[PDB]
Amino acid sequence: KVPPTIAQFQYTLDRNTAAETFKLFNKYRPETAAEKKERLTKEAAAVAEGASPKPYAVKYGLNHVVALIENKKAKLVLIANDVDPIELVVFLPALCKKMGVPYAIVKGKARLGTLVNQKTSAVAALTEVEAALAKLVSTIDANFADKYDEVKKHW
Amino acid sequence: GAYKYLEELQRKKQSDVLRFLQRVRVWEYRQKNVIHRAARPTRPDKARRLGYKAKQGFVIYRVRVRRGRSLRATAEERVGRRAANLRVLNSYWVNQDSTYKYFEVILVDPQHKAIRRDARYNWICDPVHKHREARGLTATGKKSRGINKGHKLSLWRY
Amino acid sequence: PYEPLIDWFTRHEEVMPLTAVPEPKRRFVPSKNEAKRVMKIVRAIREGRIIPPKKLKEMKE
Amino acid sequence: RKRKMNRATRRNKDKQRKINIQSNPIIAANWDYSLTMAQNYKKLGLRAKLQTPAGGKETEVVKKLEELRSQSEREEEWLEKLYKKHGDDYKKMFFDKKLNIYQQSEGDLKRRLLRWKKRNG
Amino acid sequence: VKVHFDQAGKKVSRRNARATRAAKIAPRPLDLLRPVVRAPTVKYNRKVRAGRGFTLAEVKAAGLTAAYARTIGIAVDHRRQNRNQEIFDANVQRLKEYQSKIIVFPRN
Amino acid sequence: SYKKGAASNRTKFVRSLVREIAGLSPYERRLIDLIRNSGEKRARKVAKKRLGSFTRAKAKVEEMNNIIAASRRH
RNA sequence: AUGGUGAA
RNA sequence: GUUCUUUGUAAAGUGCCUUCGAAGAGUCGAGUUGUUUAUGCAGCUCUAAGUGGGUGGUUCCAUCUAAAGCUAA
RNA sequence: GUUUGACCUCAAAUCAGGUAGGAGUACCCGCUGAACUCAAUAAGCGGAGGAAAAGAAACCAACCGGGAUUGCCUUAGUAACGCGAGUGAAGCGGCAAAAGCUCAAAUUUGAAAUCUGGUACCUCGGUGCCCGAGUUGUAAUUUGGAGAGGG
Q: Does D105 touch chain C (CB under 8 A)?
A: no
| Of the candidates A102, A94, A93, A89, the residue with the CA atom closest to the CA atom of residue A135 | A102
User: Could you tell me how far CA C11 lies from the centroid of its own chain?
Assistant: 34
CATH classification of the domain holding A63: 3.30.1330.30
Distance measured from the CA of protein residue C54 to the C1' of nucleotide H59, in angstroms: 88
The beta-carbon neighbor of C19 closest among F10, F17, F70 is F10
Length of chain E: 108
| C15: β partners | none
Q: What is the DSSP code string of B72-113?
A: HHHHHHHHHHH-TTSEEEEEEEEEE-SSEEEEEEEEE-SSSH
DSSP, collapsed to helix, strand or coil, labels residue B63 as strand
Pairing of strands B58-66, E48-50: unpaired
To the nearest whole Å, the CA of C31 is away from the closest chain D CA by: 10
As a whole number of angstroms, the distance between CA A100 and CA A93 comes to 10
Q: Does C33 touch chain A (CB under 8 A)?
A: no
Q: Write the single-letter amino acid at E5.
A: F
Q: Write the single-letter amino acid at A145.
A: A
Angle between helices B2-11 and B16-31 in degrees, nearest 10: 90
* Residue of B11, B14, B20, B95 for testing the chain A interface, max A β-carbons within 10 Å: B20
Number of separate domains in chain A: 1
As a whole number of angstroms, the distance between CA A6 and CA A83 comes to 13
Tell me the torsion sign for CA atoms C20, C23, C27, C28. Answer: positive
Distance measured from the CA of protein residue B149 to the C1' of nucleotide I87, in angstroms: 25
φ, ψ for residue D48, nearest 5 deg: -100, -25
Given a contact as 3+ CB pairs under 8 Å, which chains touch B? A, E, F
* Residue of D74, D94, D102, D103 for testing the chain C interface, max C β-carbons within 10 Å: D102
Give nearest nucleotide to B132 (CA–C1'): I47
Length of chain D: 121
Angle between helices F54-73 and F40-50 in degrees, nearest 10: 130
DSSP, collapsed to helix, strand or coil, labels residue E38 as strand
As a whole number of angstroms, the distance between CA A72 and CA A66 comes to 10
Q: What is the DSSP code string of A112-126?
A: HHHTTSSS--SEEEE
The beta-carbon neighbor of C30 closest among A40, A42, A52 is A52
Distance measured from the CA of protein residue B133 to the C1' of nucleotide I53, in angstroms: 14
Q: Does residue B37 contact residue F50 with C-beta atoms inside 8 Å?
A: no
Tell me whether residues F19 and C9 touch, CB distance under 8 A. yes
Tell me whether residues F21 and B4 touch, CB distance under 8 A. no
Q: How many CB atoms lie within 10 A of CB A34?
A: 8
Q: What is the DSSP code string of A15-78?
A: HHHHHHHHHHHHTTPPPPHHHHHHHHHHHHHHHHH---PPP---B--HHHHHHHTTTT--SEEE
To the nearest whole Å, the CA of D32 is away from the closest chain C CA by: 51
Q: Does D102 touch chain C (CB under 8 A)?
A: yes
For residue F70, give its domain range.
1-74
Q: Which positions on chain I have an atom < 7 Å from some protein CB?
A: 5-10, 17-21, 29-32, 40, 46-49, 51-55, 57-69, 72-73, 90-117, 127-139, 144-146, 148-151
For residue E79, give its domain range.
1-106
Surface-to-core class of residue D38, CB atoms within 10 Å of its CB (0-12 exposed, 13-18 middle, 19+ buried): middle
Q: Which DSSP category does E74 fall into?
A: B
**CA closest to C26 among chain D residues:** D102
**CA closest to A69 among chain B residues:** B1
Q: Write the single-letter amino acid at E108.
A: N
As a whole number of angstroms, the distance between CA E28 and CA C25 comes to 44
The beta-carbon neighbor of B21 closest among A63, A86, A91 is A86
Q: Does C50 touch chain D (CB under 8 A)?
A: no
Q: Report CA dihedral (B54, B55, B58, B60) to the nearest 10 degrees.
A: 20
The yes-or-no reply on C/E contact (3 CB pairs or more, < 8 Å) is no
Given a contact as 3+ CB pairs under 8 Å, which chains touch D? C, E
Angle between helices B2-11 and F10-22 in degrees, nearest 10: 50
Number of separate domains in chain F: 1
Q: Which residues of C touch A56 (CB under 8 A)?
A: none
Tell me the torsion sign for CA atoms E91, E93, E97, E100. Answer: positive
Tell me whether residues B155 and E7 touch, CB distance under 8 A. no
Angle at D38 between CA D36 and CA D41, to 5 degrees: 105
Distance measured from the CA of protein residue B150 to the C1' of nucleotide I69, in angstroms: 13
How far is CA A143 from each of CA A92, A146, B94, C6, D106, rounded to the nearest angstrom? 19, 7, 37, 22, 53
Domains of chain B: 1-158 (3.40.1120.10)
Q: Which residues of F touch C9 (CB under 8 A)?
A: 16-17, 19-20
Tell me whether residues E7 and B154 touch, CB distance under 8 A. no
Tell me whether residues E1 and B155 touch, CB distance under 8 A. yes
| Of the candidates B73, B140, B139, B62, the residue with the CA atom closest to the CA atom of residue B102 | B62
Tell me the torsion sign for CA atoms F60, F61, F65, F71. Answer: positive
As a whole number of angstroms, the distance between CA C39 and CA C31 comes to 13
To the nearest whole Å, the CA of C29 is away from the closest chain D CA by: 5
Distance measured from the CA of protein residue D113 to the C1' of nucleotide I141, in angstroms: 28
Phi/psi region, residue C2 (left: phi>0; alpha: psi -120 to 50; beta: rest), is beta
Q: Does residue B105 contact residue B75 with C-beta atoms inside 8 Å?
A: yes
Angle between helices F10-22 and B16-31 in degrees, nearest 10: 70
Angle between helices A132-140 and A15-26 in degrees, nearest 10: 150
As a whole number of angstroms, the distance between CA B95 and CA E78 comes to 41
Alpha-helical (H) ranges within D1-121 are: 2-6, 25-30, 37-44, 59-65, 73-86, 90-94, 106-118
**CA closest to C9 among chain F residues:** F20
CATH classification of the domain holding F10: 1.10.10.1760
As a whole number of angstroms, the distance between CA B117 and CA B130 comes to 18
Q: Which DSSP category does C52 fall into?
A: -
Structure's resolution in angstroms = 3.9
**What stretch of H or E contains F45?**
helix F40-50
Q: Which residues of C touch A52 (CB under 8 A)?
A: 30
Q: Which residues of C touch F70 (CB under 8 A)?
A: 8
φ, ψ for residue B51, nearest 5 deg: 90, 0
| Of the candidates E14, E19, E34, the residue with the CA atom closest to the CA atom of residue E76 | E34
To the nearest whole Å, the CA of A4 is away from the closest chain C CA by: 6
Q: What residues contact D71, with CB distance under 8 A and at least 6 apart?
A: D79, D112, D115, D116
Tell me whether residues B44 and A85 touch, CB distance under 8 A. yes
Number of separate domains in chain E: 1
Strand arrangement, sheet containing B87-96:
B35-38, B58-66, B100-108, B87-96
Tell me whether residues F15 and B9 touch, CB distance under 8 A. no
DSSP, collapsed to helix, strand or coil, labels residue E49 as strand
How far is CA B157 from each of CA A7, C26, E4, E7, E8, rounded to the nearest angstrom? 81, 71, 6, 8, 10
**CA closest to B11 among chain F residues:** F18
User: Could you tell me how far CA E85 lies from the centroid of its own chain?
Assistant: 20
Q: Does residue A47 contact residue C38 with C-beta atoms inside 8 Å?
A: yes
Output the furthest CA–CA distance in chain F (Å, rounded): 44
φ, ψ for residue F26, nearest 5 deg: -55, -35
**Portion 3-42 of A in contact with C at CB < 8 A:** 3-5, 38, 40-42
Q: Write the single-letter amino acid at B71.
A: L
Give nearest nucleotide to F4 (CA–C1'): H51
Q: How many CB atoms lie within 10 A of CB D77?
A: 11
Q: Does residue E65 contact residue D63 with C-beta atoms inside 8 Å?
A: no
Tell me whether residues E2 and B157 touch, CB distance under 8 A. no
How far is CA D5 from each of CA D1, D8, D9, D10, D11, rounded to the nearest angstrom? 6, 12, 14, 17, 20
